[PDB]
Design a protein around this ligand. Structure first.
Ligand SMILES: NC(=O)C1=CN([C@@H]2O[C@H](COP(=O)(O)OP(=O)(O)OC[C@H]3O[C@@H](n4cnc5c(N)ncnc54)[C@@H](OP(=O)(O)O)[C@@H]3O)[C@@H](O)[C@H]2O)C=CC1
Ligand SMILES: COc1ccc(OCCCCC(=O)O)cc1Cc1cnc(N)nc1N
Length: 186
């Protein structure tokens, strides 16, 4: 199993969602970036694994579920089996990461991408180890009801650039945004 990563798009006020939807109007190229980053695997014969909470899973339009070309794992203690369309279910993040080491997945998974929501991001971000955060900064305030956890910049270094990630300002639907990559190792 390869690297562990979080990927998120976040407003200036740290918003990531409002009532199970994104706080801002759809940004087509931003979604294309998410798709490209989470799907693209460095290793031949492997796929990336996406880990998400239950509410995040059900926030994805049914047409886009499961995220194609990726192994889809849902976190829940209430569910008794993976949701329709999903591949795996784990009770905890630690359990999910342990599963990747089991003979059923260790040979199949390259990168692991945590794609939400708030509590899953928080635990990953505060757990010792090598972790990258791929953060799209939506450069406006948007009314939100769930939020990205604090990024401790003493720990998370903003990288000056990263291959495959544009460094300049993007704009769709009159909304400016930019792509960032953070890395810790503790
Ligand atoms: N802008 C962006 O980049 C992103 C935005 N979002 C949006 O943000 C909203 C935020 O979602 P949020 O409310 O945080 O919900 P989550 O997706 O984290 O789902 C919360 C639920 O997930 C299960 N869960 C979460 N963590 C764990 C864990 N460690 N172990 C076991 N089960 C877990 C649930 O199940 P249970 O009660 O069944 O045990 C818990 O009630 C989403 O609705 C989505 O629309 C989501 C991702 C990215
Ligand atoms: C839960 O995170 C997401 C999951 C899906 C999603 O839709 C993207 C459609 C792309 C098509 C595909 O991947 O096949 C959007 C999100 C939210 C999200 C958006 N942007 C970034 N940078 N990170 C996210 N987690």
């Amino acid at each position: 199993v390869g690297s562990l990563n979080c990927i998120v798009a976040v407003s200036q006020n740290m918003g990531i969602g409002k009532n199970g939807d994104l706080p801002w109007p759809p940004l087509r190229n931003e979604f294309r970036y998410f798709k490209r980053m989470t799907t693209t695997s460095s290793v031949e014969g492997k796929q990336n694994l996406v880990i998400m909470g239950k509410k995040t899973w059900f926030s994805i339009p049914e047409k886009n579920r499961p995220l194609k070309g990726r192994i889809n794992l849902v976190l829940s203690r209430e569910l008794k089996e993976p949701p329709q369309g999903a591949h795996f279910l784990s009770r905890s993040l630690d359990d999910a990461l342990k599963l990747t080491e089991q003979p059923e997945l260790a040979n199949k998974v390259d990168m692991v991408w945590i794609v939400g929501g708030s509590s899953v991001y928080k635990e990953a971000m505060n757990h010792p180890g090598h972790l990258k955060l791929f953060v799209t900064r939506i450069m406006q305030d948007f009314e939100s009801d769930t939020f990205f956890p604090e990024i401790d910049l003493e720990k998370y270094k903003l990288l000056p650039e990263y291959p495959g990630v544009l460094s300049d300002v993007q704009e769709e639907k009159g909304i400016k945004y930019k792509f960032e990559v953070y890395e810790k190792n503790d």
